[PDB]
Design a protein around this motif. Structure first.
Motif, PDB file in Angstrom:
ATOM      1  N   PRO A   1      -2.681  -5.625   7.381  1.00 40.96           N
ATOM      2  CA  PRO A   1      -2.017  -5.072   8.800  1.00 40.96           C
ATOM      3  C   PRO A   1      -2.525  -3.496   9.023  1.00 40.96           C
ATOM      4  N   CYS A   2      -2.363  -3.067  10.260  1.00 38.59           N
ATOM      5  CA  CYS A   2      -2.615  -1.690  10.588  1.00 38.59           C
ATOM      6  C   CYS A   2      -1.561  -0.594   9.797  1.00 38.59           C
ATOM      7  N   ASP A   3      -2.121  -0.374   8.596  1.00 35.30           N
ATOM      8  CA  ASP A   3      -1.224   0.424   7.688  1.00 35.30           C
ATOM      9  C   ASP A   3      -2.017   1.754   7.580  1.00 35.30           C
TER      10      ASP A   3
ATOM     11  N   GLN B   1      -9.134  -5.765  16.723  1.00 32.58           N
ATOM     12  CA  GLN B   1      -9.070  -7.093  16.267  1.00 32.58           C
ATOM     13  C   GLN B   1      -8.060  -7.437  15.152  1.00 32.58           C
ATOM     14  N   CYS B   2      -6.707  -6.894  15.283  1.00 35.73           N
ATOM     15  CA  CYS B   2      -5.737  -7.139  14.377  1.00 35.73           C
ATOM     16  C   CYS B   2      -4.743  -8.031  15.035  1.00 35.73           C
ATOM     17  N   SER B   3      -3.503  -8.155  14.534  1.00 33.47           N
ATOM     18  CA  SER B   3      -2.331  -9.087  14.979  1.00 33.47           C
ATOM     19  C   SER B   3      -2.033  -8.669  16.532  1.00 33.47           C
TER      20      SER B   3
ATOM     21  N   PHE C   1      -3.359   4.625  18.565  1.00 32.00           N
ATOM     22  CA  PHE C   1      -2.854   3.659  18.958  1.00 32.00           C
ATOM     23  C   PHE C   1      -4.017   2.595  18.598  1.00 32.00           C
ATOM     24  N   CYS C   2      -3.828   1.503  18.150  1.00 28.72           N
ATOM     25  CA  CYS C   2      -4.656   0.277  18.339  1.00 28.72           C
ATOM     26  C   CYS C   2      -4.664  -0.197  19.927  1.00 28.72           C
ATOM     27  N   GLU C   3      -5.880  -0.396  20.426  1.00 32.24           N
ATOM     28  CA  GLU C   3      -6.118  -0.821  21.770  1.00 32.24           C
ATOM     29  C   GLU C   3      -6.228  -2.400  21.505  1.00 32.24           C
TER      30      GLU C   3
ATOM     31  N   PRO D   1     -12.343   0.571  18.197  1.00 30.13           N
ATOM     32  CA  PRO D   1     -11.496  -0.323  17.742  1.00 30.13           C
ATOM     33  C   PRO D   1     -11.529  -0.657  16.017  1.00 30.13           C
ATOM     34  N   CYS D   2     -10.473  -1.096  15.556  1.00 30.69           N
ATOM     35  CA  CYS D   2     -10.453  -1.691  14.198  1.00 30.69           C
ATOM     36  C   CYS D   2     -10.120  -2.964  14.212  1.00 30.69           C
ATOM     37  N   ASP D   3     -10.551  -3.491  12.792  1.00 26.80           N
ATOM     38  CA  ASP D   3     -10.862  -4.940  12.627  1.00 26.80           C
ATOM     39  C   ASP D   3     -10.777  -5.182  11.186  1.00 26.80           C
TER      40      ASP D   3
ATOM     41  N   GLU E   1       0.820  -9.025  17.737  1.00 24.78           N
ATOM     42  CA  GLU E   1       1.855  -8.247  17.454  1.00 24.78           C
ATOM     43  C   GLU E   1       1.740  -6.981  16.378  1.00 24.78           C
ATOM     44  N   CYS E   2       0.672  -6.211  16.343  1.00 26.51           N
ATOM     45  CA  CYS E   2       0.686  -5.037  15.621  1.00 26.51           C
ATOM     46  C   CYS E   2       1.567  -3.995  16.040  1.00 26.51           C
ATOM     47  N   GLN E   3       2.262  -3.151  14.970  1.00 30.45           N
ATOM     48  CA  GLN E   3       3.200  -2.534  15.369  1.00 30.45           C
ATOM     49  C   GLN E   3       2.570  -1.118  15.941  1.00 30.45           C
TER      50      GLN E   3
HETATM   51 ZN   LIG Z   1      -3.443  -2.681  14.965  1.00 31.95          ZN
END
Ligand SMILES: [Zn+2]
Ligand SMILES: COC1=CC(C)=NC(=O)C1CNC(=O)c1c(C)n([C@H](C)C2CCN(CC(C)(F)F)CC2)c2ccccc12
Ligand SMILES: [Zn+2]
Ligand SMILES: [Zn+2]
Ligand SMILES: [Zn+2]
Ligand SMILES: [Zn+2]
Ligand SMILES: [Zn+2]
Ligand SMILES: [Zn+2]
Ligand SMILES: [Zn+2]
Lengths: 365, 570, 125, 10
Positions: free
Chosen positions: B371-373, B390-392, B384-386, B364-366, B394-396
């Protein structure tokens, strides 16, 4: 000077020419009966009787009808009902055969082991408790009365390659085993779990219940270490509460788990220390599968090396050792001496070699 | 200072230490030997006494009845000049051999295993082989940098002897380091199987013995400790993904915004306590909500009651005000040994006191505000982010669930189509989330997570060695089981691979770029599924809740008692 | 029928009467339990203490096989309905709360479970 | 330095 002196009183040779991997005196025979022993090699087991003096009478011999089998080790026990002796042989096929030499028939066979059995052992206190070590990485403890597998000493912290030796301690409270992974491992059997598993194994009967017997699979040892030896550890024995074990570092090392002071039964699995008390230096035993033995009273220690020379040390010598072994050669003994076996009374010593030869050395009058 | 200079100095110290240790011990050991000899005497005596009570009738030989000229014989020739002895040879008859197998521990889910930088063991195959090609034995050792336990010059080493070698080497050296950085190089190069130098320095740290323990909150030496220290042990060691402390699957720790929570909700009015509440003189709810409204930015007329706070209670307050935010009705109820009133006063006292002052594996990212850019690990990893990210909200780049009505075993399900099993928190509609103990269910794309496998039976293979047989009959593409094992780095696979290459069979199955599954040492029953090019199965790797997990399905409808095979593509 | 089947755990053969295989709902591998227990104890720097509460938990979720976050509330409930007996016995009710807070911080339990779980632990005392 | 053989050698 040295003790104790012997003289080669005979030598003989089997007909196959293959190596005699295992030799075992029958220590179960009542005093004032003839001192018996058995040898394993090729696909056969042979039984010989010593007689005063020099004469070794050929008693019995047995061949596995499977051509390919090759017995590596034997061990004596008894039927405590009918008072028979019972020889156990095991080999390369991973199959333990039980011979009864009064009925002269293979009365039992156990075929659970994956690969070869490199050593067999019997519980000093329990003539039904057989312990098979193997090239499959697990030791297996069997109750030969009930046709049950008690315990399989392998898995996670089990051995990582072949298990080459093990010994019950003098009271039958713990197994110390070793093998190819360079590692000696200590497995208690006085614990509630095992002693219970032992009991229920007696109570097990297959006409009484549709279930199988629930063989305790032990994944963890009560101690382990790899700091003693630097290659495969091929023979290990219990000198009371100390460990005699040899690798091919031209010595048998006498060591103990933990620090100088730390008691064996107060050692905890996680223990990271060992201590070297002494070394019984020998020469020219570079190959593996070279066993030693000792006499019943544990006063003498005998290792036959690979160039036909037998080394015998005294275990009433305080301090190293260092000095000095009683070395005994013969001008027609050349081949590698797989294993030595004293008679019960320490009078006779047998040895067997790669060239199918058997060497009888007796003691001072 | 010389590179080989340190080694010679390490060598001669070691050589000296071993001698002066031996003579000291040589005194003690004599006593130990005498003592041990005393133990022998006793226990041998006990067996010997038992031996008297046995009467074993041993040594019987049999010639009769006379040899029928059917049996073979065994001769034994003598150097004593007693004539050659002859005995007919007893046939120990028929026993079916079992196929060969090496012992292995059973698993339900996989098991992360650390790399081993030295092979502790050199495999004996070689006597019948007669060292040909002896090149294999060299090239096997090269993969481990030429490091095998125990390859050295030095003849022995133990821990009690090791710490003295570091301490006698620090004495030896002006001073101090106070513990050197240079010397751990020298004592590793002398001991390849104990190195690298890094590993010996950490071994020395474990050996020389406790801050930063916070002691027992349930205990007599419980200190008054800040929130993050009271909880340091739990946050640092809990696994978010599988829900265990020090799990066997996931090696990366907390992230650490995983164990920070959204502060809301709700901050609602709830009175009375009751009744001995924090009330009702100006400063009750006003200065409480004020102090935290004064603390967020970047009264109290009655004299405060007199009670004393133990080390446990003070910590337990601090830990609760973090997660309960000024709700002293709740905190008091929770602390149990104080009242709503006294909590509030202690807060007030504490506000006034000063502090001293190609596919990749998912991880996982955080990055908290941003944003997840194209700089996000996940989108760099083309994953994908799962949920565990620890992002938004509503991360895209977050995989959404499936809305499916039911089974979701076709391309119309977004999960099935991504080569993913459903997510039991996201896929709320199909029933990957539905009743648990009822482990068969409407959604049929959750079977790996649930470990819902068919019954498999062990017998010898109708081709070679061992093979595995399905008890209950099953249809095309249906789930048979997960292929489970150890998880290991492409490196450690390459080392074990090379050794299995010589045994002409490997049980490695390639999971992703970063990891391989190795059913050799430990696995589960479906590992005995053989290799057949025309198989009755296939092996799909899938993505399940961050873990990549192998899936063995049928490739065809299968009759009861059939032997399972699959193609090994790798 | 017949094919000689064997036990996966001890390569001894399967008698016809035993299959009937398997009535047992597999599984928890025995050893995995001992591994955690020992691997927790081995921590230099963790409390005595904190160690035993973690051990109890790790065993709980291994026994029950929890997959999803939405389970965990129910899992916090079950943890006291089973192991909450032996928590009180060891004086760990405060580390258990510390655990609830950790679990709350990781975002797995509603705050409505921290009070409702410590209610059921003190209700049996 | 070297790896172990069960049999020597001739
Ligand atoms: Zn994300
Ligand atoms: C995997 O289990 C089997 C599936 C099938 C289809 N047939 C079988 O006979 C087995 C059982 N085989 C094993 O367990 C073996 C296993 C697990 N192996 C692998 C290569 C072991 C062989 C021994 N090495 C020892 C070591 C640690 F590498 F030094 C470790 C890897 C064998 C190699 C040759 C023959 C048998 C095996
Ligand atoms: Zn985990
Ligand atoms: Zn209140
Ligand atoms: Zn991100
Ligand atoms: Zn992400
Ligand atoms: Zn779906
Ligand atoms: Zn879905
Ligand atoms: Zn679904």
């Amino acid at each position: 000077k040295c003790k104790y002196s012997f003289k080669c009183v005979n030598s003989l040779k089997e007909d196959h020419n293959q190596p005699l991997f295992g030799v075992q005196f029958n220590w179960h025979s009542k005093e004032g009966d003839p001192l018996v022993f058995a040898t394993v090699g090729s696909n056969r087991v042979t039984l010989y009787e010593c007689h005063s003096q020099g004469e070794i009478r050929l008693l019995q011999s047995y061949v596995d009808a499977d051509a390919d089998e090759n017995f590596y080790t034997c061990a004596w026990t008894y039927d405590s009902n009918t008072s028979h002796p019972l020889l156990a042989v095991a080999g390369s096929r991973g199959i333990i055969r039980i011979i009864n030499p009064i009925t002269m028939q293979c009365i039992k066979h156990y075929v659970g082991h994956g690969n070869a059995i490199n050593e067999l052992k019997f519980h000093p206190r329990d003539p039904n408790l057989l312990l098979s070590v193997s090239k499959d990485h697990a030791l297996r403890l069997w109750n030969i009365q009930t046709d049950t597998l008690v315990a399989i000493f392998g898995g996670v912290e089990g051995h990582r390659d072949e298990v080459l030796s093990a010994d019950y301690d003098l009271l039958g409270e713990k197994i110390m085993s070793c093998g190819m992974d360079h590692s000696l491992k200590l497995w208690r059997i006085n614990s509630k779990r095992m002693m219970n598993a032992i009991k229920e194994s007696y109570d097990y009967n297959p006409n009484k219940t549709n279930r199988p017997f629930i063989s305790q699979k032990i994944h963890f040892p009560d101690f382990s270490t790899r700091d003693i030896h630097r290659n495969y550890v091929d023979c290990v024995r219990w000198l009371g509460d100390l460990i005699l074990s040899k690798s091919c570092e031209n010595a048998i090392v006498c060591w103990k788990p933990g620090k100088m002071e730390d008691d064996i039964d107060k050692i905890k699995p996680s223990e990271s220390n060992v201590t070297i008390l002494g070394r019984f230096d020998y020469s020219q035993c570079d190959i593996w599968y070279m066993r030693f033995s000792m006499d019943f009273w544990q006063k003498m220690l005998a290792l036959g090396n690979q160039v036909g020379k037998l080394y015998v040390w005294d275990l009433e010598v305080e301090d190293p050792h260092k000095a000095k072994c009683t070395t005994l050669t013969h001008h027609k003994c050349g081949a590698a001496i797989r294993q030595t076996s004293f008679s019960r009374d320490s009078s006779i010593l047998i040895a067997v070699c790669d060239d199918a030869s058997i060497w009888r050395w007796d003691r001072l009058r | 200072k010389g590179p080989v200079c340190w080694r010679k100095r390490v060598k001669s110290e070691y050589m000296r230490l071993r001698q002066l240790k031996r003579f000291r011990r040589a005194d003690e050991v004599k006593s130990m030997f005498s003592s041990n000899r005393q133990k022998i005497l006793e226990r041998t005596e006990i067996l010997n006494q038992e031996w008297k009570q046995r009467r074993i009738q041993p040594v019987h030989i049999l010639t009769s009845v006379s040899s029928l000229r059917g049996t073979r014989e065994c001769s034994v020739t003598s150097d004593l000049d007693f004539p050659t002895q002859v005995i007919p040879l007893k046939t120990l008859n028929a026993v079916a051999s079992v196929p060969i197998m090496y012992s292995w521990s059973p698993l339900q889910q996989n098991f992360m295993v650390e790399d081993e930088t030295v092979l502790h063991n050199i495999p004996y195959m070689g006597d019948e082989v007669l060292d040909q090609d002896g090149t294999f034995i060299e090239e096997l050792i090269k993969n481990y940098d030429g490091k095998v336990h125990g390859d050295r010059e030095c003849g022995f080493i133990n821990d009690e002897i090791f710490v003295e070698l570091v301490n006698a080497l620090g004495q030896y050296n002006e001073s101090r380091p106070p513990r050197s950085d240079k010397i751990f190089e020298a004592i590793s190069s002398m001991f390849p199987d104990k190195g690298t130098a890094e590993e010996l320095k950490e071994k020395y740290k474990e050996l020389t013995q406790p801050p930063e323990c916070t002691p027992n909150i349930d205990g007599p030496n419980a200190k008054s400790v800040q929130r993050e220290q009271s909880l340091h042990s739990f946050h640092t060691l809990f696994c978010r993904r599988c829900f265990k402390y020090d799990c066997f699957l996931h090696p990366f720790h907390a992230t650490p915004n995983t164990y920070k929570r959204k502060n809301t909700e709700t901050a609602l009015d709830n009175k009375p306590c009751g009744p001995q509440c924090y009330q009702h003189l100006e400063g009750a709810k006003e200065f409480a909500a004020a102090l935290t409204a004064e603390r967020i930015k970047t009264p109290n007329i009655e004299p405060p009651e007199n009670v004393e706070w133990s080390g446990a209670e003070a910590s337990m307050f601090r830990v609760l005000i973090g997660t309960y935010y000024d709700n002293f009705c709740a905190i008091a109820r929770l602390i149990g040994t104080k009242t709503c009133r006294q909590v509030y006063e202690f807060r007030v006292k504490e506000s006034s006191i000063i502090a001293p002052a190609h596919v990749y594996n998912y991880q996982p990212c955080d990055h908290p505000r941003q944003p997840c850019d194209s700089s996000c690990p996940c989108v760099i990893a083309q994953n994908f982010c799962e949920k565990f990210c620890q992002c938004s909200s509503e991360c895209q780049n977050r995989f959404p669930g499936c809305r499916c009505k039911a089974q979701c075993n076709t391309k119309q399900c977004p999960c099935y189509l991504a080569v993913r099993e459903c997510d039991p928190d996201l896929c709320l509609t199909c029933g990957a989330a539905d009743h648990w103990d009822s482990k068969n269910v409407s959604c049929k794309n959750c079977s790996i997570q649930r470990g819902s496998k068919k019954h498999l039976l062990l017998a010898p293979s109708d081709v070679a060695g061992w093979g595995i047989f399905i008890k209950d009959p099953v249809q095309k593409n249906e789930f048979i089981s997960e292929y489970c094992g150890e998880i290991i780095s492409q490196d450690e696979a390459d080392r074990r691979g090379k050794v299995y290459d010589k045994y002409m069979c490997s049980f490695l199955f390639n999971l992703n770029n970063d990891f391989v599954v190795d059913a050799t040492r430990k696995g589960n029953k479906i590992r005995f599924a053989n290799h057949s090019v025309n198989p009755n199965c296939y092996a799909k790797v899938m993505m399940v809740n961050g873990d990549h997990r192998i899936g063995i399905f049928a490739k065809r409808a299968i009759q009861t008692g059939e032997e399972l095979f699959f193609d090994y593509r790798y | 029928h017949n094919r000689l089947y064997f036990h996966s755990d001890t390569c001894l053969p399967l008698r016809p009467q035993e299959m009937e295989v398997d009535s047992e709902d597999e599984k928890d591998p025995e050893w995995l339990r001992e591994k955690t227990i020992t691997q927790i104890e081995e921590f230099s720097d963790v409390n005595e203490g904190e160690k035993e509460v973690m051990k109890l938990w790790n065993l709980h979720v291994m026994k029950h096989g929890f997959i999803a976050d939405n389970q965990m509330n129910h899992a916090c409930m079950l943890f006291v309905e089973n192991y909450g007996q032996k928590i009180i016995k060891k004086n760990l009710c405060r580390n258990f709360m510390l655990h609830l807070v950790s679990m709350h911080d990781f975002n797995l339990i509603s705050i409505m479970s921290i009070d409702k779980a410590v209610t059921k632990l003190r209700e049996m005392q | 330095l070297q790896a172990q053989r069960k049999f020597a050698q001739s």
